[PDB]
Write a protein that binds this ligand. Structure first.
Ligand SMILES: [Mg+2]
Length: 1310
RNA sequence: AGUAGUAGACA
């Protein structure tokens, strides 16, 4: 009933006071926060920092290791097999036993080789044996492992084993010999890595000859395949049962030997696989200084590497290193083609590929940090004004331990000085780009070559708490200095006029807040009805827990335990706990009323990102989520009506909106300006633009949340009262003070440290009880993004109003874009046309008339614009970053996107590289669909069709080897099915090879429908046995879909159906999953069919619906699987385990294949199946085949005219659950719940009448039948492309554009 | 010995 809360009275702020304050503030010279970019300045910065660096860190004489694996190749590489491994291992051990060991590592490999060569015939039989026929032996306990006890170890090998189970220096970058040595070493490595050892046709001319056929002969290519084999062996050894034993593998005809030492299993957290590599000395990933030993022979040298301990993250990174480098070099290839208008030469391509492969091999945190610095440094020295001195000072705040670090520093220094001298010379080549986009993209690809979360876990666990503790302490000092009331309620403007120090972060001006709210109300009042309806269109009377966001599997804080930590749970568990302990299902406002007295609590956990410092995100408790949901719903509803706020936009509508803003800015500058003159005359003026790509320093931490309260009390909503407004203000008051708990991991770490250094003592003092402290003002990051972004928009509008009042004679222009801590400001200013006469005189006349603030607009008035905008933003506790903010007349950066004028450049390599890590863990069909979907998303984001096709091939191959369905593997369909690999349905291991264009247009499930059409046509034409077999396979798939339940249906949708996979089974079975028996759950699902499409709105039925949710196969899998645990997928999927679902039991994929074959061979085509398949072929091809028909029928001819590049532009591709619920509703509670869910309960029947007819026409099926509509319903619930300028928004034109871009350098006419 | 680190770790 929206309980009445205390409101806040206005204070009557006057815009005249702020205008006169700005008049005074602009009469003095103001120091610009940025520095001009010149070659001499950057050179001086580098020189000073380089000379000062030697005092920061102790002298180091030995460069540290940078290569994770050391190996070498002299000949072409062949993939390893079992027999090949056996013969290679025998030959390699024969070679090794003839060498002389001197280091303990050489002694250890000698002992391992002796033990392996002294293994019997039976041991060699059990060794290499598949899991089907493996039998335990005295020496061999696992298929690929042997035992090597201490009775068979020398003194040196045992010494090495003891070594394994036992301030930071830096090199001299200032030294000119250290740089030379590092450059020589890295250059030698790179040079030896380059040593040579319809769309399909276009791919053949271009992507094969100049990209694939060039890099296929390189040493890097074959070394990458060898690294894949070695990492596959190490992954196989990392199993929970195999890891405690020794292992010996050989590659390249016995030239490379991998010795795997006993290791902690990689299924555990914080474990390392330990291994040694012994190889023949030659070209490749060789670092002689960091090699453990070199054993000489009769003109043969054998490099023995150190013992390397590698974690799961780096091992999985190394496993896909070849594909990573390949996609990176292909992206570089396309970008070079776009920039230079020509294909790169062979030497440059080989160099780029070797550089990418070296970067992917060296998965080290320090190189990642260096590249993270570089991706910000490059925009700094390429701008007009930037914080490049601070960025260069930050680049030197690190020790350079490895040779690669010194080499990269050398290259970075050279590139930055050359850039600031000015044409964009490349960082990893010797080409001169014409566009800054080519350069920034290339270095961003280099940055994305590093996997996320390479940081040290223990250090980062503290580094994520440090900032929150520090800024809470700062807030405490501010409260002590100025008083609690002044800090919380803000300072008045008359106080700022007396104390100019008041303008700083965590302090705000009440007058500024009110004036900004007035400026926003000037827009909000012209759409009062729209704003009010949007507010009322929220979940204000809907029950709280009947929302998907309220029962999700995302993290949640529980209650303070006996030890004092905050519990870890998920949202659904807390929802079920509250519902069990409650009597009804409360509303959002009711839930806030019940839990208002409890206090906001939070924890911080790692985000696991690839930045130099890992930011952490906060997990709060339930009442905190209620308060935040109230505030964020209110402010999202209000902010949807503001065009300068960009979080409220869609996922990719932001790019379109910022494009429109840029067109407005460029249209304003197209023209001229006129300044009236004393004697009714006019001084002409030229319009100019200046973009500020701005970041915000400590956007949430250095903030005061109370500033929102008054803002909320003054923002215009069309509601007829203040009840909801007062509730939002109350909720904001209830998040002002929060409990911040430290993680138990950091707590135990500090508890294990005995004595404490002073900084750790200062950090620990923030927590009085030792577990949680109190944070004021700071709204936790990602909790009030919409509110704070709208507040920043309001402050920008306040600056606009103040500046307009300041200079009514000046017709300046302003465009503002806010996305929280990201901002894009566009200042349109005026310059004298001819010389400066009649303008300097005019400004002097204005000064002589008392308008002293005109001193700021004498020259470069955009500087004064930014100064005043920054000051007014600081009035609202918003600091523009002095380092991360760039100022430029041409180039802008916003939302990870680069603009040059109005052009758009989105980095598509990020999602392309993430496709290689795409693993939903739900099945072969689902994972293939996800990978292809991400490749299609890359195509929409600017990837070329050829590069997208290459990534599609790589991702499909990766998924095929992941699930064992590729030819020669155990789950290959051809071994058990009487059909071909390409004629098999995809859910049954069918071939995933499919062109990118059809996936982009037709869809993801096109392959199964095409196979169904082929089988139907064959059977209806000549009645083959093979076509009847394929139809029987489709029938078998349809049976499996019927065996499942409607409420258990996730992932991609296939009408034919697919196998159901359960992959991860928890050992604890979760909480609240046993209060209702399985029989009860299935009977309830049988007798309550309305709830397979809607959520129950009553507590009694919603508790059952939620307890049933904890037993979904896709829920227990997703509630226990982590991002890298795809490691386990190499054992229980490829080698195969009890994963798939068949006949109400969990079996292997092999059992599913056998059952499919048996059902398909004994299959007869009936009339019902005939009609069903006919409808499927005649209804899904009425639109999808038209895409295939459009692509096949069209013809492309290559015009001899050379391709012309152009600026890119973003174009567009131009409730039902309640309906099924109403259809299936029988009981009174089901009807009530579907009426509540439905927005228009009265029209529902008519809607149902429209649903039956619409499906009967478009889908050719009647929803009156239960099974048909049950199959149809998942599909009934159903894009922005970066193209060239001439392409229109019609969906028939974007496919045409893709066909035109089928060739990278040639023009195509259709 | 590795990863990591001017927060003491894996161990
Ligand atoms: Mg920015």
């Amino acid at each position: 009933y929206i309980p009445d809360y205390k409101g806040m009275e206005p204070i009557g702020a006057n815009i005249e006071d702020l205008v006169d304050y700005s008049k005074d503030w602009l009469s003095r010279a103001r120091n610009f926060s940025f520095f001009e970019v010149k070659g001499t300045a950057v050179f001086e910065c580098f020189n000073s920092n380089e000379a000062n660096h030697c005092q920061r860190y102790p002298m180091s004489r030995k460069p540290r290791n940078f290569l994770l694996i050391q190996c070498s190749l002299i000949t072409s590489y062949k993939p390893a097999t079992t027999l090949s491994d056996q013969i290679d291992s025998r030959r390699a051990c024969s070679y090794i036993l003839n060498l002389i060991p001197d280091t303990p590592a050489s002694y250890l490999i000698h002992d391992m080789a002796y033990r392996y060569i002294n293994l019997t015939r039976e041991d060699m039989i059990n060794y290499y044996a598949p899991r089907i026929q493996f039998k335990q032996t005295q020496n061999v306990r696992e298929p690929g492992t042997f035992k090597l006890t201490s009775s068979m170890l020398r003194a040196e090998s045992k010494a090495m084993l003891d070594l394994l189970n036992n301030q930071i220096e830096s090199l001299n970058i200032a030294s000119h010999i250290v740089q030379s040595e590092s450059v020589s070493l890295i250059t030698k490595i790179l040079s030896d890595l380059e040593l040579n050892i319809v769309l399909d046709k276009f791919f053949q001319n271009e992507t094969q000859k100049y990209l694939i056929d060039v890099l296929k002969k390189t040493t890097a290519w074959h070394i990458g395949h060898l690294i894949r084999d070695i990492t596959e062996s190490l992954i196989a050894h990392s199993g929970l049962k195999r890891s405690k034993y020794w292992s010996l593998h050989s590659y390249n005809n016995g030239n490379v030997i991998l010795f795997i030492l006993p290791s902690k299993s990689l299924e555990v957290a914080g474990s390392f696989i330990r291994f040694i590599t012994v190889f023949r000395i030659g070209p490749g990933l060789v670092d002689k200084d960091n090699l453990d030993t070199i054993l000489i022979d009769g003109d043969s040298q054998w490099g023995v590497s150190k013992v390397m301990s590698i974690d799961l993250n780096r091992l999985l990174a190394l496993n896909i290193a070849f594909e990573k480098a390949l996609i990176a070099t292909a992206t570089w290839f396309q970008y070079y083609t776009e920039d230079q208008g020509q294909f790169p030469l062979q030497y440059a391509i080989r160099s780029v590929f070797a550089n990418h492969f070296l970067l992917a091999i060296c998965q080290k945190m320090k190189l990642c940090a260096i590249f993270d610095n570089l991706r910000y440094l490059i925009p700094a020295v390429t701008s007009l004004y930037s914080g490049f001195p601070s960025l260069i000072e930050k680049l030197f705040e690190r020790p350079f331990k490895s040779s690669l670090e010194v080499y990269i520093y050398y290259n970075i220094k050279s590139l930055l000085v050359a850039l600031a001298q000015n044409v964009y010379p490349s960082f990893m080549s010797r080409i001169v780009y014409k566009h800054y986009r080519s350069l920034i993209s290339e270095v961003t690809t280099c940055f994305f070559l590093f996997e996320k979360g390479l940081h040290g876990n223990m250090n980062e666990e503290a580094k994520i708490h440090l900032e929150t503790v520090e800024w809470a302490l700062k807030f405490r000092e501010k409260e002590e200095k100025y008083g609690e009331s002044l800090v919380e309620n803000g300072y008045m403007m008359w106080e700022l006029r007396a104390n100019a120090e008041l303008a700083e972060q965590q302090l705000y001006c009440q007058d500024a807040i009110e004036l900004a709210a007035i400026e926003l109300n000037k827009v909000l009042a012209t759409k009062s009805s729209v704003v009010a309806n949007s507010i009322l269109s929220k979940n204000w009377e809907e029950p709280y827990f009947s929302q998907t966001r309220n029962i999700s599997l995302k993290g949640m804080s529980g209650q303070v335990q006996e030890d004092g930590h905050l519990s870890s749970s998920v949202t659904i568990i807390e929802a079920i706990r509250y519902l069990s302990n409650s009597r009804h299902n409360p509303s959002l406002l009711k839930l806030y009323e019940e839990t208002r007295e409890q206090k906001a609590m939070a924890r911080i956990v790692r985000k696991y990102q690839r930045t130099e410092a890992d930011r952490g995100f906060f997990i709060t408790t339930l009442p905190t989520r209620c308060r935040l949901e109230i505030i964020e719903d209110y402010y999202d509803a209000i902010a949807k009506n503001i065009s300068e706020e960009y979080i409220s936009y869609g996922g990719e509508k932001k790019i379109l909106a910022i494009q429109g803003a840029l067109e407005k800015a460029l249209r304003w500058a197209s023209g001229e300006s006129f300044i009236e003159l004393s004697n009714h005359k006019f001084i002409r003026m030229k319009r100019k633009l200046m973009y500020v790509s701005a970041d915000a320093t400590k956007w949430s931490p250095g903030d005061n949340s109370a500033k929102f309260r008054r803002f909320t009390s003054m923002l215009h909503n069309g509601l007829p009262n203040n009840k909801l407004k007062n509730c939002v203000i109350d909720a904001l008051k209830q998040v002002y003070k929060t409990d911040f708990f430290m993680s138990r991991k950091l707590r135990n770490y500090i508890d294990s440290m005995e004595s404490l250094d002073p900084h750790i003592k200062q950090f620990l003092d923030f927590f009085p009880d030792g577990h949680h402290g109190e944070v004021k003002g700071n709204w936790l990051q990602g909790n009030l993004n919409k509110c704070s972004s709208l507040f920043g928009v309001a402050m920008s509008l306040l600056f606009k109003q103040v500046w307009t009042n300041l200079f009514p004679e000046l017709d300046c222009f302003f465009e503002f874009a806010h996305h929280s801590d990201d901002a894009l400001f566009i200042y349109g200013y005026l310059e004298p046309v001819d010389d400066g006469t009649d303008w300097f005189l005019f400004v002097s006349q204005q000064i002589q008339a008392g308008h002293l603030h005109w001193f700021s607009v004498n020259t470069e008035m955009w500087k004064s614009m930014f100064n005043l905008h920054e000051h007014i933003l600081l009035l609202g506790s918003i600091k523009i970053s002095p380092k991360k903010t760039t100022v430029s007349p041409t180039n802008a950066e916003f939302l990870s996107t680069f603009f040059e004028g109005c052009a758009v450049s989105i980095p598509f390599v990020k999602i392309l590289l993430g496709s290689l890590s795409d693993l939903p863990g739900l099945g072969y069909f689902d994972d293939l669909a996800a990978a292809q979907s991400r490749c299609v998303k890359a195509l929409d984001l600017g990837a070329s069709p050829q590069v997208a096709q290459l990534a599609v091939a790589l991702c499909t191959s990766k998924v095929e080897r992941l699930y064992g369905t590729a030819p020669g593997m155990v789950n290959h369909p051809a071994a058990y099915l009487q059909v071909k690999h390409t004629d098999t349905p995809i859910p049954l291991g069918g071939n995933g090879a499919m062109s990118i264009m059809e996936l982009a247009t037709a869809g993801i499930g096109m392959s199964d429908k095409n196979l169904l059409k082929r089988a139907l046509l064959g059977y209806s034409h000549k009645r083959q046995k093979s076509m009847l077999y394929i139809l029987g396979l489709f029938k078998f798939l349809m049976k499996l879909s019927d065996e499942t339940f409607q409420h258990e249906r996730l992932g991609q949708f296939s009408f034919i159906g697919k196998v159901q996979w359960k992959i991860f089974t928890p050992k604890s079975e979760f909480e609240f999953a046993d209060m209702y028996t399985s029989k009860f759950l299935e009977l309830w699902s049988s007798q309550h069919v309305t709830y397979d499409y809607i959520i129950p709105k009553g507590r009694d039925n919603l508790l059952i619906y939620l307890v049933r949710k904890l037993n979904d196969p896709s829920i227990v899998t997703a509630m226990t699987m982590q991002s890298p645990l795809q490691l386990r997928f190499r054992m229980q999927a490829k080698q195969h385990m009890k994963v798939c679902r068949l006949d109400g039991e969990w079996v292997t994929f092999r059992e599913v294949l056998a059952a499919a074959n048996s059902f398909a061979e004994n299959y007869s085509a009936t009339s019902q199946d005939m009609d069903l398949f006919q409808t499927l072929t005649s209804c899904t091809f009425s639109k999808e085949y038209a895409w295939k028909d459009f692509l096949n029928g069209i013809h492309c001819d290559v015009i001899p005219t050379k391709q012309v590049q152009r600026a890119k532009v973003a174009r567009t591709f131009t409730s039902i659950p309640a309906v099924i619920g109403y259809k299936f509703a029988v009981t009174v509670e089901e009807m009530s719940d579907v009426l509540d869910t439905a927005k228009f309960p009265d029209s529902l029947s008519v809607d149902l009448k429209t649903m039956k007819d619409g499906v009967y026409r478009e889908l050719g099926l009647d929803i009156s039948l239960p099974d048909v509509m049950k199959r149809i319903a998942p599909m009934l619930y159903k894009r922005v492309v970066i193209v060239q300028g001439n392409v229109e928004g019609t969906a028939e034109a974007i496919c045409r554009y893709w066909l035109k871009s089928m060739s990278l350098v040639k023009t195509i006419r259709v």
